[PDB]
Design an enzyme around this catalytic site. Structure first.
Site, PDB file in Angstrom:
ATOM      1  N   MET A 169      -7.414   4.973 -72.366  1.00 47.27           N
ATOM      2  CA  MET A 169      -7.784   5.282 -73.662  1.00 47.27           C
ATOM      3  C   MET A 169      -9.251   5.904 -73.784  1.00 47.27           C
ATOM      4  O   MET A 169      -9.807   6.432 -74.870  1.00 47.27           O
ATOM      5  CB  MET A 169      -8.372   3.741 -74.385  1.00 47.27           C
ATOM      6  N   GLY A 170      -9.447   6.797 -72.458  1.00 41.75           N
ATOM      7  CA  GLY A 170     -10.585   7.748 -72.334  1.00 41.75           C
ATOM      8  C   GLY A 170     -12.019   7.185 -72.096  1.00 41.75           C
ATOM      9  O   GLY A 170     -12.915   7.867 -72.099  1.00 41.75           O
ATOM     10  N   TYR A 171     -11.950   5.882 -71.613  1.00 43.66           N
ATOM     11  CA  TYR A 171     -13.175   5.042 -71.400  1.00 43.66           C
ATOM     12  C   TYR A 171     -13.633   5.576 -70.190  1.00 43.66           C
ATOM     13  O   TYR A 171     -14.792   5.264 -69.674  1.00 43.66           O
ATOM     14  CB  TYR A 171     -13.288   3.672 -71.720  1.00 43.66           C
ATOM     15  N   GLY A 172     -12.636   5.721 -68.987  1.00 43.99           N
ATOM     16  CA  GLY A 172     -13.235   6.041 -67.706  1.00 43.99           C
ATOM     17  C   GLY A 172     -13.854   7.438 -67.559  1.00 43.99           C
ATOM     18  O   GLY A 172     -14.347   7.568 -66.429  1.00 43.99           O
ATOM     19  N   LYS A 173     -13.971   8.075 -68.601  1.00 41.95           N
ATOM     20  CA  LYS A 173     -14.417   9.368 -68.320  1.00 41.95           C
ATOM     21  C   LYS A 173     -15.929   9.530 -69.163  1.00 41.95           C
ATOM     22  O   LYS A 173     -16.716  10.100 -68.547  1.00 41.95           O
ATOM     23  CB  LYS A 173     -13.661  10.422 -69.210  1.00 41.95           C
TER      24      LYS A 173
ATOM     25  N   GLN B 104      -7.639   1.547 -68.195  1.00 45.60           N
ATOM     26  CA  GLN B 104      -7.776   2.958 -68.292  1.00 45.60           C
ATOM     27  C   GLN B 104      -6.987   3.467 -69.659  1.00 45.60           C
ATOM     28  O   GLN B 104      -6.785   3.139 -70.355  1.00 45.60           O
ATOM     29  CB  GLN B 104      -7.098   3.648 -67.017  1.00 45.60           C
TER      30      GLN B 104
ATOM     31  N   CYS C 268     -20.186   5.825 -55.651  1.00 42.26           N
ATOM     32  CA  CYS C 268     -18.893   5.166 -55.755  1.00 42.26           C
ATOM     33  C   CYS C 268     -18.877   4.796 -57.468  1.00 42.26           C
ATOM     34  O   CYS C 268     -19.564   3.975 -57.907  1.00 42.26           O
ATOM     35  CB  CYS C 268     -18.968   4.048 -54.952  1.00 42.26           C
ATOM     36  N   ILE C 269     -17.984   5.626 -58.099  1.00 38.59           N
ATOM     37  CA  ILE C 269     -17.583   5.314 -59.269  1.00 38.59           C
ATOM     38  C   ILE C 269     -16.193   4.949 -59.425  1.00 38.59           C
ATOM     39  O   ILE C 269     -15.018   5.519 -59.035  1.00 38.59           O
ATOM     40  CB  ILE C 269     -17.974   6.627 -60.242  1.00 38.59           C
ATOM     41  N   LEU C 270     -15.787   3.857 -60.190  1.00 40.98           N
ATOM     42  CA  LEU C 270     -14.435   3.440 -60.411  1.00 40.98           C
ATOM     43  C   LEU C 270     -14.365   2.409 -61.346  1.00 40.98           C
ATOM     44  O   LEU C 270     -15.221   1.674 -61.554  1.00 40.98           O
ATOM     45  CB  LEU C 270     -14.144   2.613 -58.988  1.00 40.98           C
TER      46      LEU C 270
ATOM     47  N   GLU D  38     -21.253  14.509 -54.175  1.00 40.57           N
ATOM     48  CA  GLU D  38     -20.703  15.129 -53.040  1.00 40.57           C
ATOM     49  C   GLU D  38     -19.273  15.193 -52.955  1.00 40.57           C
ATOM     50  O   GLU D  38     -18.664  15.193 -54.032  1.00 40.57           O
ATOM     51  CB  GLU D  38     -21.451  14.248 -52.057  1.00 40.57           C
TER      52      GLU D  38
END
Lengths: 41, 280, 76, 208, 97, 97, 86, 93, 97, 79, 105, 94
Positions: B153-157, B151, B143-145, B177
């Site tokens: 500004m590209g930091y969630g990537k 969000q 689980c990634i959130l 998965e």
DNA sequence: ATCAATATCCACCTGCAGATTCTACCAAAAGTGTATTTGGAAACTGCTCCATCAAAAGGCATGTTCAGCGGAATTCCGCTGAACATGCCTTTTGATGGAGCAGTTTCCAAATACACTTTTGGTAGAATCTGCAGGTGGATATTGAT
DNA sequence: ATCAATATCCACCTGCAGATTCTACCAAAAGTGTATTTGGAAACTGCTCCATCAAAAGGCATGTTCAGCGGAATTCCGCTGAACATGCCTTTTGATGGAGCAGTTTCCAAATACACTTTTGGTAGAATCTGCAGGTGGATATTGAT
């Protein structure tokens, strides 16, 4: 007497009985063990 | 009652209208307000106290060891054994954010890594991803959130391109998965698009397919998913194992903007050596 | 059972703790920079020094109650 | 979006190598207490008439915690019983030994130094913890004024509580297990390299 | 007890192991291996000991065939030992599909 | 009298008869002219016990135990092209370096 | 409650260097190393390729054990019959 | 099934050289051999008689089958012993 | 009156013959070969045109398979030539004799 | 007299270069004739016993495509 | 009037059911629930012919004829092994050259 | 003079997916041999397992395990999926 | 780098084999109700057999070190394929005969069924004993640093 | 050249283990005998595809030069057999749980088989366009001389 002489002469050797219980690893070579305690000054 | 619980909740520095329901403590719903601060994470519903009852503690920093650091965002590591409680509530911080996965079983057997903004006073979390201990069904992440204030500004990537680095910092491949992704459906696709094209520019070609898993740890069962997510990367193997190609390269010329979401591969180990055979 | 499962688990809560003899020195090794050259921030050296064994004292809660469970079996 | 700076006091210092840290909640957060708002300002209603000794805002927040550590720790089988606990003068053995915010496992090896102002200061309780006053003396000083409010407080919900909760062989293996005790004193004694510096360093100027 | 030339006790070992007839991979770690590469396919199945016995003799026949034709590949290559490139060569023109 | 043992071939012609009937699919099987077959299972099964008279001629020990059976089939090249498909259990390899 | 039985689903792919016994059952001399990882990989590949259609035979047969008969039938149709053991 | 080729391979080993001894698992080896070669000849014989649009099996297509699936010298000795025993059945009704 | 570099017209030869698909051997010497190699088994047969067609595409398929795996064994041998030894060793380790 | 020499070194040169070879060492010709006659006799023997069975004393395309379907080299197209 | 192609299938149910009666090492065969199989060949002749004209248009010949079949019936990665024992007639060989030979010598 | 092939059915399945197509009879023979021998392949292995599973009615679920068994993986998964939906939509005989 | 020299890509041109509709016809079957006979889905309950699990004995797996040799790189150096080109050799084509392939009708023969005994071959209760596997000391190759 | 301790073959005795040969139930297929059925054997007839047989041209054949090429050798070095000392986890034999197989027994959905009865998919001619095979020709892409 509490202002003049006590402030270092009771503190000149307490920092150097570490060198008998840094030898507590023997009883890897690591004789010059300077990891954690020899550089606290 | 799978909807968000109450009408306004602040998360430290900004208010967030939450998405979904969480197994929050039920008896706080009749008063109309719930609010929650950054580093204690202990739940309240009225600002009558933590206006200065966060003189309960001088915690500025979470007990995760800050394992990277950069110009802009750091991150750290929590295990479910050395701490029992504030490791647990960070999921219930965001089970109102996450759509499906909630707790019935206790959250102890998962290591817990969390992405974090540098701050002027105490560095604040943005994301979380959850590696298990060893080889559940492969499945190197879970689980990634990201926190919904921060969000775009590209930091969630860049934390799902940290996630693959601690697989060959332990030298075995891994990949997520299915479970569900329409919320970030193209996001991991976006990195799995450019995880190969940014490092197919050097090969001195006649290169096979399985060494990509030995060098970028992105597995054999999804390289071909990304070799068909974008254009034709075949028509050469016909009597052996799959072969990969190159083309007119209208990609790397676009790899000057949206490229700097990187990590400096220079920091500490992440092996848990113990077994802790869990049964309950 | 009382030896066997109760053997090792007092080391993985100390598996984070070789760090105590590696938390401490380089910020005492950075505040010696403050006295090598009037008592403004010189007070706070002790208040992070006294926290050396303080969780090891909380480990001394555990690492002397596990010794205090020597008599849970009839042999030891 | 303006509530920030009344709970944004504090200071910050950066790293030297990496920010390594390890704790729990109940030794980092320190205390354990909890209040309402209708006991914050008008449980001390007419205390303005008769405030000869101490009456401030931030002195009654510690002893509101310590008494309910009797229930959830010293009597764990007490799950729903209304005839719960002994009276305030009858719980006098619950003050000589207790565990209020894990006190005596924090206060057992605290008197071997005897610092000149006062002993132990931790970086894991907040900044103003001394005139945040010692409850060594305040059970027999003003202990009775908090009891009867508590003695009616829990019984309206009587068994769970109104603040939120969590809903539903010997040979050759255990020998280094006692050889992890040659660290018996070897950390604070060379914390006492410089933890005897301060009782006389603080006051060099008093020739004048 | 001085040592002779390097190699001939290995060659006496290959003649010993070739003229003998036993099973060679030790059985209970191989049983653990076939279990825990089996239950990932479908959850808990059981075996019976003659079936896993047939498994180990089948796999030892197969990879001794793979080692004999990679030995012929290595002796083709004007070499005396084997590498990775001749073993995947031998499996390649075997036609593993 | 007894249909096999009158016929000089001593495998059961009766038991070979329905095994064609339980298996073949042209749904009528000739009665007397399946006998012409099970000559052959006599003639083949002689031709792997009769050249397993090698052990009683050279391998010294009389009751023939199954690593003896790896001195006729692949190893004896006339029989190799009928039994590549079979890998015999617990036999081994014929010696060569 | 219990809800799951014990599994040692970990690194069992290290079998042993008994590959340095069965190599010497074949005619091969000195072995030069660094082949053990891919020969363990190919042993894993052939074993999974036979056990998964064998367990399709078992799960077709409404059972939940395997037997010798259906696994020798499984490798019989897989292309090489193990022989005289069921 | 609950059947075997045990006592028949006993007696054929006894009608050749009587000294040796059939062993425990070797009877399963020889049983697997005879059952596998029978299933082989049966499926190609049935498919032969199928694809020539014919509607019974005879002597001659299994003769051509056992010629069809063998090395040459063993096929010739096999078909010779086959013709010999089928004509010795044909001699007496 | 111009000599190319040696071997560079070989690569355009193999591209020319590889892109095209027609039956590359010529038919009637092959037809005489298959007739007077069928003569030895029983005389006085005759053929069909699609039958000999099936024979020629079968033999160019088997021949092109043996040429590609002997080429790959050749480049395994750090050798850009094919010789007797590599075609017969590839012939062996693809199994058949 | 012999006619296995009827196939010639440009023809099997082409048949090799369809595979992808550059060099042809000048004595592979006689054993490529040998392997072709080996495969060809091994297929025409079971084709001729197919046609000797069915009482037609010519071969057809159907029995040779069934013959290749026998011996693990199943051709398509012609049956 | 729907002649038993009414499970969304378009292959002859009657001839596959008579052919399973033809093959028939056993005795009886389920005439309604033998429909399961001739739909199963509807996958992998279509998923064989859908990749046929997948690139038959890339050679720009509208009547698709024998060579382009093999140019990805044996280059389609998983339809190789279902057709490996076949060598289809006059359909060519894939364009492949090992890069040890192409070295600019 | 009577003989039966799979010409028009394969013509209709592939015009029905792709209308801009045409077929040579040589390629139509190549696909006829394809569908015929994979038919006989499923038939013989399905009949073999239904033989030794003490059974005589050739039911649907053993050809389901058969088509899972000899077809390779991903195409076996899609095959068993459309077979399942086919026998679903035939069971509703409306 | 800077052009001569190939040549392949693209486009357009006709000829023709041929696929695609078509469509009548039509022999041949899918497909339809109707009993129906039985193989199968499921469920009973006994019970052989797998699975965890353990204590101690010991062969054997890991690690580490040392000597050396086989791999590999790089070299020089004869030689045999490749590449053109001319000379020729049998091909690849259209054109006229003739024994088998593939329909048919009838004749008989051999396999179905069905049952009536009945030897015979699987099973196990169980002798038995010898044919092996294994130790153990007495003769004989084993192949080097010296 | 050569002795060296090491490993190998053999007669001799010993526990044990599964062939193996009754005993006999015993259950059950197989030899044998009808009655009639449908399928193979042989003869035929005739329509073909198979064999065989002459005149234009492209692909084989046999050359000659030359250079990429394989082969031989030789030395350099890392990495692998071998030994030994040691840990470890196999490694066999009990032991109880417990259950999923398995034989039996059971009632019932359903595939076979059957007269009819309609459409319907081969086929065979057949128009008939058209897709492409071959050829010609113009331009950009590719390769070797200097």
């Amino acid at each position: 007497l509490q202002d003049r002489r006590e402030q270092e002469d009771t503190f000149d050797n307490l920092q150097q009985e570490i060198y008998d219980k840094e030898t507590e690893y023997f009883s890897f070579n690591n004789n010059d063990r300077i990891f954690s305690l020899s550089s606290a000054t | 009652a799978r909807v968000r619980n109450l009408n306004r909740i602040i998360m430290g520095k900004y208010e967030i209208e939450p998405w979904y329901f969480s197994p929050y403590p039920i008896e706080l719903t009749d008063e109309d307000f719930i609010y929650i601060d950054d580093f204690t994470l202990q739940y309240f519903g009225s600002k009558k106290q933590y206006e200065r009852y966060r003189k309960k503690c001088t915690l500025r920093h979470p007990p995760g060891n800050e394992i990277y650091r950069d110009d802009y965002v750091s991150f750290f590591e929590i295990d479910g054994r050395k701490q029992r409680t504030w490791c647990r509530n960070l999921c219930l911080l965001s089970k109102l954010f996450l759509d499906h996965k909630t707790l019935y079983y206790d959250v102890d057997p998962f290591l817990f890594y969390c992405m974090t903004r540098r701050d002027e006073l105490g560095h604040h979390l943005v994301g979380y991803f959850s590696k298990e201990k060893e080889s559940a069904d492969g499945y190197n992440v879970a689980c990634i959130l990201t926190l919904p204030q921060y969000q775009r500004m590209g930091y969630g990537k860049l934390l799902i391109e940290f996630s693959y680095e601690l697989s060959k910092k332990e030298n075995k491949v891994g990949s997520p998965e299915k479970p569900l992704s329409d919320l970030g459906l193209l996001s991991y696709r976006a990195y799995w698009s450019d995880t190969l094209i940014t490092l197919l520019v050097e090969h001195q070609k006649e290169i096979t397919i399985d060494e990509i898993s030995s060098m970028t740890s992105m597995t054999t069962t999804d390289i071909l998913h990304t070799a068909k997510t974008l254009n034709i990367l075949r028509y050469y193997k016909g009597q052996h194992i799959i072969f990969l190609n190159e083309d007119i390269l209208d990609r790397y010329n676009r790899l000057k903007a949206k490229k700097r979401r990187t990590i400096d591969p220079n920091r500490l180990i992440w092996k848990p050596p113990v077994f802790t055979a869990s049964q309950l | 059972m009382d030896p066997s499962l109760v053997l090792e688990q007092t080391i993985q809560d100390v598996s984070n703790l070789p760090s105590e003899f590696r938390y401490l020195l380089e910020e005492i090794g950075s505040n010696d920079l403050k006295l090598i050259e009037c008592q403004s921030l010189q007070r706070e050296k002790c208040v992070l020094a006294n926290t050396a064994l303080f969780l090891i004292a909380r480990h001394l809660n555990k690492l002397e109650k596990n010794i205090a469970l020597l008599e849970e079996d009839g042999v030891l | 979006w303006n509530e920030y700076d009344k709970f944004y006091t504090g200071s910050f210092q950066e790293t030297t190598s990496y920010i390594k840290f390890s704790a729990t909640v109940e030794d980092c957060c320190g205390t354990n207490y909890n209040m309402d708002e209708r006991d914050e300002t008008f449980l001390n209603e007419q205390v303005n008439k008769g405030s000869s000794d101490i009456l401030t805002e931030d002195e009654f927040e510690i002893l509101c915690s310590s008494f309910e550590h009797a229930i959830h720790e010293r009597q764990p089988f007490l799950s729903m019983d209304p005839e719960s606990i002994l009276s305030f003068e009858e719980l006098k053995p619950t003050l000589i030994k207790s565990d209020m915010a894990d006190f005596n496992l924090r206060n057992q090896l605290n008197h071997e130094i005897n610092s000149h102002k006062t002993h132990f200061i931790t970086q894991f309780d907040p900044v103003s913890q001394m005139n945040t006053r010692p409850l060594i003396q305040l059970i027999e000083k003003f202990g009775s004024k908090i009891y009867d409010y508590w003695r009616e407080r829990k019984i309206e919900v009587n068994g769970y509580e109104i603040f939120p909760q969590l809903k539903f062989i010997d040979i050759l293996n255990s020998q280094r297990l006692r050889a992890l005790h040659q660290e018996l004193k070897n950390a604070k004694d060379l914390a006492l390299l410089v933890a005897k510096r301060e009782n006389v360093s603080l006051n060099w100027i008093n020739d004048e | 007890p001085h040592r002779y030339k390097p190699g001939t006790v290995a060659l006496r070992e290959i003649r010993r192991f070739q003229k003998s007839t036993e099973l060679l991979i030790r059985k209970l770690p191989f049983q653990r291996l076939v279990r825990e590469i089996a239950q990932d396919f479908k959850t808990d199945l059981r075996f019976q000991s003659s079936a896993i016995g047939a498994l180990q003799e089948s796999v030892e026949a197969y990879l001794v065939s793979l080692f004999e034709d990679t030995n012929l590949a290595a002796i083709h290559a004007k070499r005396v030992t084997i590498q990775k490139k001749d073993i995947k060569l031998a499996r390649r023109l075997r036609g593993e599909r | 009298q007894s249909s096999s043992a009158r016929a000089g071939l001593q495998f059961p012609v009766g038991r070979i008869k329905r095994y064609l009937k339980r298996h073949a699919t042209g749904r009528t099987r000739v009665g007397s002219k399946a006998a012409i077959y099970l000559t052959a299972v006599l003639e083949y099964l002689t031709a792997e016990v009769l050249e397993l008279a090698g052990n009683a001629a050279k391998d010294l020990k009389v009751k023939r135990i199954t690593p003896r059976h790896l001195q006729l089939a692949i190893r004896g090249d006339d029989e190799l092209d009928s039994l590549i498909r079979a890998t015999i259990a617990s036999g081994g390899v014929l010696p060569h370096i | 409650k219990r809800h799951r039985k014990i599994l040692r689903d970990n690194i069992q792919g290290i079998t042993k260097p008994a590959i340095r016994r069965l190599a010497r059952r074949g005619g091969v001399k000195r072995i030069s190393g660094l082949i053990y990882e891919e020969v363990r990989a190919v042993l894993k590949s052939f074993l999974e390729s036979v056990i998964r259609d064998s367990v399709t035979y078992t799960e077709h047969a409404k059972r939940k054990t395997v037997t010798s008969l259906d696994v020798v039938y499984a490798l019989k149709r897989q292309g090489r019959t193990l022989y005289g053991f069921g | 099934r609950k059947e075997t080729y045990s006592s028949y391979i006993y007696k054929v080993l006894k009608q050749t050289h009587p000294d040796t001894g059939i062993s425990q698992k070797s009877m399963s080896i020889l049983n697997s051999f005879v059952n596998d070669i029978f299933e082989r000849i049966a499926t190609e014989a049935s498919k032969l008689a199928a694809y020539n649009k014919k509607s019974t099996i005879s002597a001659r297509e299994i003769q051509t089958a056992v010629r069809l699936i063998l090395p040459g010298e063993l096929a010739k000795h096999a078909v010779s012993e086959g013709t010999r025993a089928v004509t010795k059945y044909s001699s007496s009704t």
